[PDB]
């Protein structure tokens, strides 16, 4: 006899839309986020097996899509800087790092030509004499971020809608894919700070026992290797160049904010990293890679890519976008303080979204941020050498795909749908 | 969820309370759209199961007796194997291919033939 049961403890892999939860101005706000659960107690699904996969994990895809949406909505109503896409008269004020550029705003407000000046970094200036254009003057629209809106990396918890559950893998040394034995059920994920960086991962979680290196396939050198450290390294970075802000009336009712003056002298931006912590960390990484690659030598080299965002380390300290030179760090051979110079940019091609760009107003200088180095994104690139070269593998910093940063924190989670109905044979009527 | 790794027989002993009814509401711009759609879908899912149980004459019951004899071509396993060996996950997968058939049989036998 077929018996119908309801409340049966089964599930199927399924996709749904997850929502933001945060502790409770900033963009991560309660119009999009709700308060967290103060006691999201895990339930151990004693003696179940679940196959997890950090790659092709739709939780990563949602995090990516919503972060993009939040950024677009936040910038949507802000000031267009298109009235400023005119030829600049530029001289100077490390050498000519910052230039004093003069220009004619020929529309502005009231249709008078307004002579005006601003201080710009050379990295945002294109030669066309001493005549210059903005780096992304044409082909895209640059909008100024609104001064009232912050983008702070508040840890965000993703939570399941009713009818859904998130399974979490608590196994040690999970390699990113395959069966997980110690599977628990949770209501929400741990909080993940939506930190954006390239080459080196910042403010993530740490591995429990040792450095764990994960890859979809190690032979396939086209894939990014994600390295999660079990110990963080603290680095502090700064932009010491004290300045004043200049408010320029460009839009009929709005305003553009630029750098008006520099207070005191000019010094290159920089990051302070420990000599010892850094090479001890590499020793640990290299050890694991030596195991993975069967004793061939591990070498660390510089990025050879073509993207300024990748060849330089990239992060955002307060409102200042940093491009730091890490060629000094990835320079070693493992068989048997450090000051990293940095640059600052005002125009950011965020997300690699064609047609869009954003402008970063100055924050008066004298800013220093301390941050946690929690992992690396890097790739292996040698090959066709068994009878040609020595047995050395070379790894270089890699990145630019923002989904990799998010994948590194979601590797242990899977979303399933609960299916309470089922049937089975009995002897009743 | 709960002891999903237990045999079906064991699992069923707490079926009564596993069915916690963790539905929205009783528990409690594109964002607005997504949030609203999710609430609507939660309602639709809830009702879908209640409607189906109503069709089979199972509404109000945790465990519902049918009018359909078990068809053994769906599985060669004895009750002992089914209930005190296999888990619910394993079981539903074994007979996942007959779900539509089973449901159709339940609908007819409890309504059209009585």
């Amino acid at each position: 006899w077929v018996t119908v049961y309801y409340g049966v403890p089964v599930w199927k892999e399924a996709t749904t839309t997850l929502f933001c939860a945060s502790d409770a101005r900033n963009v991560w706000a309660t119009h999009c986020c709700v308060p967290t659960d103060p006691n999201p107690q895990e339930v151990v699904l004693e003696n179940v097996t679940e196959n997890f996969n950090m790659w092709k994990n739709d939780m990563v895809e949602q995090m990516h899509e919503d972060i993009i949406s939040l950024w677009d909505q936040s910038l949507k109503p802000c000031v267009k800087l298109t009235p400023l896409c005119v030829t600049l008269n530029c001289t100077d004020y490390e050498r000519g790092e910052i230039k004093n550029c003069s220009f004619n705003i020929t529309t502005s407000i009231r249709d008078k030509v307004q002579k005006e000046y601003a201080l710009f970094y050379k990295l945002d200036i294109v030669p066309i004499n001493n005549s210059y254009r903005l780096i992304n003057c044409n082909t895209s629209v640059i909008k100024q971020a609104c001064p009232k809106v912050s983008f702070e990396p508040i840890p965000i918890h993703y939570c399941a809608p009713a009818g859904f559950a998130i399974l979490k893998c608590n196994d040690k040394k999970f390699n990113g894919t395959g069966p997980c034995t110690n599977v628990s059920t949770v209501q929400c994920t741990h909080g993940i700070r939506p930190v954006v960086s390239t080459q080196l991962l910042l403010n993530g979680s740490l591995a429990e026992k040792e450095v764990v290196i994960r890859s979809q396939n190690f032979t396939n050198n086209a894939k990014v290797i994600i390295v999660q450290l079990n110990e963080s390294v603290v680095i502090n970075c700064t932009r010491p160049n004290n300045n004043t802000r200049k408010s320029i009336h460009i839009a009929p009712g709005r305003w553009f904010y630029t750098t008006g003056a520099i207070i005191g002298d000019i010094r290159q931006a920089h990051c302070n990293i420990s000599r010892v912590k850094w090479n001890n960390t590499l020793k640990q990484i290299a050890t694991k890679l030596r195991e993975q690659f069967k004793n061939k030598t591990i070498a660390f080299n510089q990025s050879s890519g073509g993207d300024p965002e990748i060849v330089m380390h990239s992060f955002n300290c307060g409102g200042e976008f940093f491009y730091c030179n890490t060629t000094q760090l990835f320079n070693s051979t493992w068989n048997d303080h450090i000051t990293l110079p940095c640059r600052i940019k005002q125009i950011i091609n965020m997300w690699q979204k064609v047609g869009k760009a954003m402008y970063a107003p100055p924050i008066r200088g004298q800013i220093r941020c301390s941050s946690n180095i929690t992992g690396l994104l890097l790739t292996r690139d040698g090959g066709s050498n068994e009878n040609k070269t020595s047995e050395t593998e070379t790894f270089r910093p890699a990145g630019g795909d923002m989904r990799d940063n998010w994948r590194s924190e979601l590797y242990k989670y899977k979303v399933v749908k609960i299916e309470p109905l089922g049937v089975a044979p009995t002897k009743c009527k | 969820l709960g002891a999903a790794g237990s045999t079906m027989g064991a699992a069923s002993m707490t079926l009564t309370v596993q069915a916690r009814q963790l539905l929205s509401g009783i528990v409690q711009t594109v964002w607005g759209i997504k949030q609203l759609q999710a609430r609507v879908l939660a309602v639709e899912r809830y009702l879908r199961d209640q409607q189906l149980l109503g069709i089979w004459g199972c509404s109000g019951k945790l465990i519902c007796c049918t009018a359909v004899p078990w068809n053994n071509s769906w599985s060669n396993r004895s009750l002992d194997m089914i209930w005190n060996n296999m888990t619910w996950i394993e079981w539903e997968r074994e007979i996942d291919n007959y779900t539509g058939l089973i449901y159709n049989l339940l609908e007819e036998s409890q309504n059209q033939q009585e």
Partner: antibody, heavy 123, light 108 residues
Framework: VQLLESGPGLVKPSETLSLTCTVS????????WNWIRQSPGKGLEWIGY???????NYNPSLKSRVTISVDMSKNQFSLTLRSVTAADTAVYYC??????????????????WGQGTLVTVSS | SYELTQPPSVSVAPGKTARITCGGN??????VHWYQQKPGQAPVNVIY???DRPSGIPERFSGSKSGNTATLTISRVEAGDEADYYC???????????FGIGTKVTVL
């Protein structure tokens, strides 16, 4: 598969009885756990059942004094009776509970019955 | 709770069928299990439903239930089957196991 009983084998009057039984194969979260005793010359007396979770029940004659613990790490269980009498001399059996999910909780006879351990109460 | 009543004993000649009965209120509406206990040994299930025998138990064992009576049937009873046979039901109103008295089966 096998269940093996153990215990002091002899307790004093007014001593609390504690019997630990080991499960040799299948992890203890897979099925229900149950204890039964048989006084010499008598048929069986059910004591109670427990499970991985808090689902449990006991025979009213013992209920006020009986609990059975669960040790998931070691796949062990232990029956504790806070009694005082020699009337509790019995062979105690470690059994696992099987069932079919029907109306009225049609619990199956406990196939993996165990071996049985005799507990004597004597001064 | 629930009543399960068995005769103290039955007796058969070797090779003959034993009819071991158990009564109770609407006993035939409950699943009724039976088991065999050899003196000094742990018991074993010999039947768990009407006509449903476990593996490991021979074809001698059968049984059925109807009305308010359950019967354990052992055909071709062997001397090796001298044993105490018992009935079991689960009482859902108390959610407890109920055991019968036990019937001694004598084999002549």
């Amino acid at each position: 598969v096998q269940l093996l009983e153990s215990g002091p084998g002899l307790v004093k009057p007014s001593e609390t009885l504690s019997l630990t039984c080991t499960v040799s194969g299948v992890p203890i979260s897979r099925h229900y756990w149950n204890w039964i005793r048989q006084s010499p010359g008598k048929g069986l007396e059910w004591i109670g059942y427990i499970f991985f979770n808090g689902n449990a029940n006991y025979n009213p004659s013992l209920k006020s004094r009986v609990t059975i613990s669960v040790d998931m790490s070691k796949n062990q269980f232990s029956l504790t009776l806070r009694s005082v009498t020699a009337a509790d001399t019995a062979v105690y059996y470690c059994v696992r509970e099987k069932s079919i999910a029907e109306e009225d909780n049609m619990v199956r006879w406990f196939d993996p019955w165990g071996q049985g351990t005799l507990v004597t109460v004597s001064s | 709770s629930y009543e399960l009543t068995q005769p103290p004993s039955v007796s058969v000649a070797p090779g003959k069928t034993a009819r071991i009965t158990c009564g109770g209120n609407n006993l035939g509406t409950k699943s009724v299990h039976w088991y065999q206990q050899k003196p000094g040994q742990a018991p074993v299930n010999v039947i768990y439903y009407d006509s449903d025998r476990p593996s490991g138990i021979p074809e001698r064992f059968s049984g059925s239930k109807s009305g308010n009576t359950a019967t354990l049937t052992i055909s071709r009873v062997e001397a090796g089957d001298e044993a105490d046979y018992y009935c079991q039901v689960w009482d859902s109103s108390r959610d407890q196991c109920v055991f019968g008295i036990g019937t001694k089966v004598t084999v002549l």
